[PDB]
Amino acid sequence: SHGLFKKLGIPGPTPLPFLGNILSYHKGFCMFDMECHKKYGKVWGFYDGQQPVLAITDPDMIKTVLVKECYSVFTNRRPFGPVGFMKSAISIAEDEEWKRLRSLLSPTFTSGKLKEMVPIIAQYGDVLVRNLRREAETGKPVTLKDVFGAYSMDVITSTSFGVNIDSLNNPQDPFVENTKKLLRFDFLDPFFLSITVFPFLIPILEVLNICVFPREVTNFLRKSVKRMKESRLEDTQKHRVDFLQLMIDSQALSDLELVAQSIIFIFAGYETTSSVLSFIMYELATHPDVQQKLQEEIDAVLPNKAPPTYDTVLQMEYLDMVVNETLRLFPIAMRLERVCKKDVEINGMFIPKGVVVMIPSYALHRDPKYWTEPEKFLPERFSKKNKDNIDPYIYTPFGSGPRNCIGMRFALMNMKLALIRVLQNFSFKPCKETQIPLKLSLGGLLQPEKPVVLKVESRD
Numbered sequence: 001s002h003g004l005f006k007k008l009g010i011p012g013p014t015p016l017p018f019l020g021n022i023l024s025y026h027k028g029f030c031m032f033d034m035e036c037h038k039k040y041g042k043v044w045g046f047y048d049g050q051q052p053v054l055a056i057t058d059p060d061m062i063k064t065v066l067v068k069e070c071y072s073v074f075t076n077r078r079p080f081g082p083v084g085f086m087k088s089a090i091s092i093a094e095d096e097e098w099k100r101l102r103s104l105l106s107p108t109f110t111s112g113k114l115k116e117m118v119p120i121i122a123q124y125g126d127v128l129v130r131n132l133r134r135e136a137e138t139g140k141p142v143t144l145k146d147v148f149g150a151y152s153m154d155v156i157t158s159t160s161f162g163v164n165i166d167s168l169n170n171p172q173d174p175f176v177e178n179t180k181k182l183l184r185f186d187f188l189d190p191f192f193l194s195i196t197v198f199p200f201l202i203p204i205l206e207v208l209n210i211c212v213f214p215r216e217v218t219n220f221l222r223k224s225v226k227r228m229k230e231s232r233l234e235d236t237q238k239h240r241v242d243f244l245q246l247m248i249d250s251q252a253l254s255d256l257e258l259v260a261q262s263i264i265f266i267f268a269g270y271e272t273t274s275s276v277l278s279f280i281m282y283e284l285a286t287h288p289d290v291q292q293k294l295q296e297e298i299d300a301v302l303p304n305k306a307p308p309t310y311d312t313v314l315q316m317e318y319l320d321m322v323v324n325e326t327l328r329l330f331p332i333a334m335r336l337e338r339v340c341k342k343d344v345e346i347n348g349m350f351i352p353k354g355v356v357v358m359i360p361s362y363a364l365h366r367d368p369k370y371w372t373e374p375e376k377f378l379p380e381r382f383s384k385k386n387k388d389n390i391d392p393y394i395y396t397p398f399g400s401g402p403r404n405c406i407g408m409r410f411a412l413m414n415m416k417l418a419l420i421r422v423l424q425n426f427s428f429k430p431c432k433e434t435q436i437p438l439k440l441s442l443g444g445l446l447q448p449e450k451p452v453v454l455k456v457e458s459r460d
C-alpha cells in the first residue's frame with residue numbers, strides 16, 4: 001500500500017512499515033500539515049497506518065471535491081473506530097443514508113427555526129453574565145473554558161430538550177453529568193493511534209459492543225429521550241421549539257436515528273462552542289483596541305445594555321469580523337476529509353479509489369500566499385473593503401458543499417449572542433497567569449497548551 005504515491009508521482013513523507021507516517025504527528029495535526037505544505041507544495045500524500053491520504057490545496061480542486069463531485073465520488077468521511085448505533089448519526093452516516101438524514105434535518109436548521117430559538121439562547125446569556133459578575137466582584141482570574149463550557153451546556157440542554165439548568169451551579173445534576181462527558185475525540189490518543197495501526201481490530205470491538213461513545217452516557221440520553229418523549233407530551237398544548245420537537249414533528253426519521261442525532265448535536269456543539277468562545281475572548285483581551293471597537297458597535301446597536309435579538313445580531317459587522325478572524329486562526333476541525341469512492345481524474349489529477357482526500361484548513365488559513373501576516377489577528381481582513389479577496393475554498397472553518405457544517409448558522413448565532421451579553425457588561429484583560437503569546441497543544445485537538453485565564457472587570 002505504501003508504494004501508492006510513489007507510483008503516482010506524488011510527493012510526501014516516506015512511510016515506515018506498519019506505522020505509515022503517524023510518528024510525524026508528535027507535534028499534532030496542524031504542524032504536520034504546515035510542514036508538509038511548505039516542503040511538498042500544492043499536493044502531497046501520506047499514510048495513516050496503511051491508509052493513503054492525499055492532501056490538496058488548489059481552490060479549484062477543493063471545490064470539485066467538496067462541491068462538484070460530492071454526491072458521485074466524495075460523499076463520505078473516513079470511518080474512525082467502533083461506533084455502534086451511532087453509525088446513523090448524520091456526521092457518520094454514508095451515501096444514501098446520509099443523503100436522507102441531511103434532508104430530514106435540513107428544515108430543522110433554517111434561519112426561521114433559528115430565530116425561534118434565539119429567546120431560549122438569550123436567556124442563558126443572562127445566566128452567564130450573572131455567574132460571571134459573581135467573579136467580576138471577586139477579582140480572581142477566570143478560566144474561560146469553564147464559564148463558557150457551562151454556557152455552552154446550558155444552551156445545548158435547553159435548545160436540544162427544553163431542559164433548563166444553570167449547569168455552572170448545578171454541577172452534579174445527572175443530565176449535566178452525562179452530557180459533560182461528550183467531549184471531542186483525540187485521534188492522537190493511544191486508543192485511536194492503535195486503531196489506526198490495527199484497523200483490522202475495529203470489527204472485533206463492534207461485535208463486543210465496545211463503542212467510542214460512552215455507553216453509560218448514550219444509555220442515559222436514550223432513556224431520557226424515550227421518557228421525555230415517552231408520554232410527557234401526552235397533552236400537546238405547549239408548543240415547543242427545541243431540536244427534539246422539530247425532529248419529533250419530522251416523524252421519516254427512525255426513533256433510533258432521532259436519538260443518534262440528539263446525541264451528535266450535543267457532541268458537535270458542546271466543546272466546539274466553548275473552545276471558540278475562549279479563543280475569541282483571548283484575542284479580545286490581548287487586543288484592547290479591538291475589544292473596545294466591538295463594545296462600541298454593540299452599544300450603538302443595543303444602547304443601554306438592550307437585549308440582543310436575531311436581527312440586531314445580524315446587524316453587527318465588526319462582531320462578525322472578529323468571529324471570522326478568530327476562526328481563521330483557530331479552525332477547530334483542522335482538516336476536512338472525503339473518501340474517494342471510485343477511480344477519478346479531477347482538475348488534471350488521477351485519484352485512486354479508496355484514497356482519503358484531505359483539505360488542510362488550518363494550513364490553508366495561515367498560508368502566506370492568501371493571507372498577509374497570517375499569524376496576526378486582524379479583523380479588518382473580513383471588512384467589506386477586504387473580504388472579496390477571500391477564497392471560500394481557502395477559508396473553510398465550517399467546510400463547504402452539501403456536507404458542510406449543518407449547525408453553522410446556529411453556532412455563529414449562539415456565540416454572537418454570548419459575546420454580546422458578556423461584552424455589554426464586562427471587559428476582559430490579561431492576567432499575570434495569562435499565557436502570552438498563546439501556545440497550541442501538541443495533542444490531536446486544536447486547543448491552548450494551558451487553559452485561557454483572564455481578569456474580568458465589570459463595566460461600572
Ligand code: HEM
Pocket residue numbers: 066090091092102264265268269272273276332333336337396397398399400401402403404405406407408410411412
Ligand atoms: C463554532 C462551532 C462549530 C464549528 C467550527 C464547526 C465546524 C464544522 C466542520 C468544519 C464540519 C465539517 C464540514 C465538511 O466536512 O465540509 C462540521 C460538520 C458538521 N457539524 Fe459543525 N461546527 C460547529 C458547531 C456545530 C453545531 C452547534 C452543530 C449542531 C447543532 C454542528 C453539527 C455538525 C454536523 C451534523 C456536521 C456533519 C454534517 C454532515 O455530515 O452532513 N456543528 N462542523
Ligand SMILES: CC(C)(C)OC(=O)NCCCCCC(=O)NCc1cccnc1
Pocket residue numbers: 080091092184185264267268272332333334335
Ligand atoms: C470540530 C471537532 C469536534 C474537533 O471535530 C471535527 O473535526 N469536526 C469535523 C468532522 C465532522 C463530523 C464531526 C462529528 O460531530 N461527528 C462525529 C465525528 C467525531 C470526530 C471525528 N469524526 C466524526
